[PDB]
Each structure stands twice: as C-alpha cells, then as structure tokens.
Design an enzyme around this catalytic site. Structure first.
Site, PDB file in Angstrom:
ATOM      1  N   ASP A   1       1.075  -1.430  -0.330  1.00 14.03           N
ATOM      2  CA  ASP A   1      -0.136  -0.117  -0.231  1.00 14.03           C
ATOM      3  C   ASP A   1       0.991   1.470  -0.152  1.00 14.03           C
ATOM      4  O   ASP A   1       2.185   1.313   0.128  1.00 14.03           O
ATOM      5  CB  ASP A   1      -0.738   0.245   1.601  1.00 14.03           C
ATOM      6  CG  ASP A   1      -1.961   0.354   1.009  1.00 14.03           C
ATOM      7  OD1 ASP A   1      -3.355   0.622  -0.373  1.00 14.03           O
ATOM      8  OD2 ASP A   1      -2.059   1.794   1.955  1.00 14.03           O
TER       9      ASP A   1
ATOM     10  N   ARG B   1       2.035   7.356  -3.250  1.00 14.17           N
ATOM     11  CA  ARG B   1       2.879   8.142  -2.585  1.00 14.17           C
ATOM     12  C   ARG B   1       4.350   7.957  -2.148  1.00 14.17           C
ATOM     13  O   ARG B   1       5.031   8.480  -2.768  1.00 14.17           O
ATOM     14  CB  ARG B   1       2.348   8.293  -0.568  1.00 14.17           C
ATOM     15  CG  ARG B   1       2.432   8.902  -0.174  1.00 14.17           C
ATOM     16  CD  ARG B   1       1.536   8.988   1.073  1.00 14.17           C
ATOM     17  NE  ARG B   1      -0.093   8.233   1.606  1.00 14.17           N
ATOM     18  CZ  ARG B   1      -1.178   8.694   1.815  1.00 14.17           C
ATOM     19  NH1 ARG B   1       0.083   8.281   3.452  1.00 14.17           N
ATOM     20  NH2 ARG B   1      -1.904   7.992   1.247  1.00 14.17           N
TER      21      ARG B   1
END
Lengths: 291, 291
Positions: free
Chosen positions: A34, A38
């Site tokens: 995950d 970013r």
C-alpha cells in the site's frame, strides 16, 4: 530460545532470527503493498520501481523465516480509476507472473505463488485480462514444486462470502457433504493456509483483504511510513513484539499481586483516562496517527 | 454540518452529535466487551456489575446516534475455563435475554436484539445451555418490533466459514440458486447488516468476531484502558476521527503541491524512519502499546 532479549534479537544475525521464527512464528504474515503511489512521488524523482520494492520486502519477509506471506495488491477502487490506471495495473499484475527477476526470485527462494480474490470475474472482460488470469494459473502450477515459502497475492480479495457459498454448493453437489473449513480455505486460496499471525499495514489503522484468515490472534501493526519504507529494525521490532510480547506467559494472577501492584496497574490506566490509539490528524490530505 | 470543528463537536450537546452521526455515520460499530475481569479486579473492590457497565456503554453508543452495535461477548477460550467459569458465563448470557433492567433498556431505546455465532452447536449440550438458546431465540423475536437500534451479540462468532457453507448449501437446495451476499449476511446475523464502520478494541492491537462485516473502511481504534472504562470524551474523539478525519476530502493532489510541501511531507516520514504503532511492552503480564 524462550528468553532472548530485544537487544540480542536486534543484534542477532539474519539466519539466527529466521531459525527463531521458524520455531516460534509468525508462520503466516499479511503484508499489503500500500501507499505505493505516495512512495513514488516522494522517493523516485513506476510499475517497474514498485516491483523492485515489492521484491525487496518479500525477500526480507521470507529471509526472516516467515513461511507464508499474504499480500493484497489490488482491491475494489481499482476498476474506478482511469482506463490508463487499469492498464498500468493489469501490467503490474502481468509482471508478478512474467517478469524475469521476480521469476528468478521465486525459484531462488523456492516460493510457490498463488492468487486469490474475485479477479477471474472482476478483471476486465478483455484480452489483456484473460492473459493475466492465464498467467496467474500458469505461475501457480509452475511454482508448484517450491516448498520453502508460499506467496498469496490478493486481487479483488476483499469479500469471499459469495465465493465461499458457490464453492460450497459445488463441493456438496459433487461430494455429497459440505466442505470442512480446511477445504473451504484450500478452495479460496488454492491451498491450505493457517490463520494469519500478524498484519502489517501503514497509516490509518485498518485491515483488509485476507478473508477467512483473521482471528483475535492476528497481531496488528501500522507503520507511520508507507509499505516500501519497511526497514530491518522495524521488522525485527514487530517480530519481537509478536513472538515475545503479545502472548506473555505465564498469564497474570491478580489475586497473587500486592495491593500496591494493583494500584500501580490501576494508575497506568487512570493517569491518562482518555488515551486511545487510532485517532489522528490530517496534513496535506494525509492522515497521521497521534500520540 | 460538513465543517464542524473538533472543539465544537466536543462541546456540542448529545442530541446534536447524534444527529450528525445519523447523517454521516458510523452506521455500524463493533464494541466487544473485553477486559471485564481486569476491570473487575481494579474498580470493584461480577456477572451483575459487568452488565451495568455493558448497559452503560451500549446506552452511550445508541444515544450517540449509532444505529447498529455489534458486540462480541463470548469467544472460543470460553469452553476452556473451569466448569464454574462456564456456568458464570452461561448465566451472564441468560441475563442479556432475561434480566429486568436490560429488557427495559431494549424497550426504552427500541432495540431489536440478535445473536450470532456457533453457540447453538458449541454451547454446553446441557439444560442451562438449551435454555440460553431458547432465551436468545425468544428475545430476537420479542424485540422484533423495535426499529431504532439493532444489537448483535457475538457468542462463538469467530469463524463463520463452515456456517456460511452449510447455510449456502441449504439455501440452494430449497431456492435453486446460491444466496447473494446480502442473504448470506441475513442468514448469519439473522438480519441484513452493513459492513462495520469502526471497531473499538483495547490493549493489544487486534480485531475479532465480526465475520463478513469487515472491510478496509472499518476504522480501527484501541483504547489503552479496558472496554468498560470508555468515557464520553474518548467516544467523541473516536467519532470525530472516523467521520471527519479518516476519509478526508478532497483527496491529495501531489502534482499540485510545491517542492517544499512534498519535502515537508517526506520528512514527516523520514524524520522518524522506524516508527510503528502496535509494538508494546509488558507490565505485570499485561501488554501496553508504546509511542
């Protein structure tokens, strides 16, 4: 063995930690990949980079003695991104089953790879998608002789209910009786897998995508930084906490404790009465845990 | 509505918070009653006390606008305690369906009560147990006309797999087709229930006993003190975090941020590189989260 200190555990050589893990666990660990995007806009300045990091962490996990890693990689929100995002994703999926280095990785570390989730029905009803499914099926069988480790990739593996129902209905039609929990798990993951001993997420306190493998014994951890940032130290501290601290023994005997001990324990709670982990704050649209 | 500050939220009157919750959620909340024994040897110096506290928290949860509360109360380790512990437990179970004040509570707050789990097969094959089951069945039907709130008590509700399989096999035999996810959920909880919007545990970071109702959107919180210690302030801060902070909008647009912003964000992670929530320390055999 049973009395290794954190300091020693943190100082021990890799092979040593692995041996302790092989014996004490965690046997099964969930590590979703995950915060990839970013991490990309923060360390690299895609599909190719995400993979080297995925390989690094997986390698790390297996080299620490963990037998099975469950890794959710693609959940629902996927089909809701642009057409290009979907293509990039289906390409990433194809890499897990096709790229040169990861294939070597599976062979080098004797990793049998399995895929779980609703990907067979949910994946785009296109060519590239039918290729991913074929690729997934092929890899699962071609890594079938590896026995050191098991890697389960989650692709739309957020809700197994309907899948369990249909798997159960077929099994009973052909077998005459309902499947056992063990057979239900083999049916969904393609092989039997014990419950998860720990889940390492990041950011917002939440877990996802490891149907049927969750129990109160699944130790939860949430790093502050995204998945790919996982360091050695962090992993060992997580491991140490789960192996030695989560289930401390012998259990506590209240009646045997002095009136002061109970009092000191009571203060550990009443001193800071409203303390709770999981509440955060937002910066640049990104949630960060407080306290 | 959409722009209430935490301070205001914390200052607002009960009815006001409830209205915000009815509109924004959480619609479904999981609140297991854990650490009861511990709370007993720390605040009271049983079966009767645990209940007044259970009623207090449930009352609190419903009065804050939460429609459905899922509350695991008895899991596996139960059958592994002494014979007396089991009797005390079966008596506690009987209280949830028989005691005077809680029955008034359900009626006063229009609470329909349901039970889930493997209790029908797992409960002691004795008289007292068959009584609990009958009691559970009766309450579920007698509170059937209440529509303000839904209360689901978990009794051996740790692994629904085998239950889903058998429920699915019967449903297909009688219906001709497999049940939908919705029907599977109604079959297990006795009524349809949306996924859980949050789980409030305590101590060790772990979740349990709310089969099929978990998703990545289930916000997780872990108080430092045991369940019954839940204060008003703590509840509102948890509520505020889930409603306003967990899913902040609009999402973050990295490309639109200055080079300094990205840099400040990057430091929020690299400044403290090995930070992780979930690792703890032990005192008197009791685990406490660090950091």
């Amino acid at each position: 063995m049973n009395l290794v200190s954190e300091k020693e555990f943190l100082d021990l050589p890799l092979v040593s930690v692995a041996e302790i893990v092989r014996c004490r666990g965690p046997k099964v660990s969930v590590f979703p990949f995950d915060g990839t995007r970013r991490w990309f806009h923060l360390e690299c300045n895609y599909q190719q980079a995400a993979l080297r990091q995925s390989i690094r962490i997986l390698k790390m996990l297996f080299e620490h003695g963990i037998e099975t890693v469950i890794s959710p990689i693609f959940s629902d929100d996927l089909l809701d991104r642009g057409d290009r995002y979907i293509v990039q994703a289906l390409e990433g999926m194809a890499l897990l089953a096709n790229d040169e280095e990861i294939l070597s990785f599976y062979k080098e570390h004797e990793v049998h790879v399995l895929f779980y989730g609703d990907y067979k029905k949910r994946l785009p009803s296109t060519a590239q998608g039918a290729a991913v499914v074929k690729s997934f099926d092929d890899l699962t069988i071609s890594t079938s002789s590896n026995t050191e480790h098991r890697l389960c990739f989650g692709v739309f593996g957020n809700d197994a209910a309907e899948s369990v129902a249909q798997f159960s209905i077929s099994w009973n039609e052909t077998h005459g009786k309902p499947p056992t929990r063990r057979e239900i798990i083999e049916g969904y993951y393609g092989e039997y897998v014990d419950k998860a001993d720990m889940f390492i997420g990041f950011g917002r306190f939440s877990t996802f995508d490891f149907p049927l493998l969750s129990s109160g014994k699944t130790s939860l951890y949430f790093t502050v930084a995204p998945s790919y940032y996982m360091t050695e130290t962090t992993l060992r501290r997580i491991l140490y906490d789960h192996i030695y601290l989560r289930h401390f023994r012998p259990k506590p005997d209240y009646s045997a404790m002095s009136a002061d001990q109970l009092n000191v324990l009571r203060n550990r709670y009443r001193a800071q009465p409203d303390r709770v982990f999981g509440v955060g704050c937002v910066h640049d649209g990104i949630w960060f845990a407080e306290g």
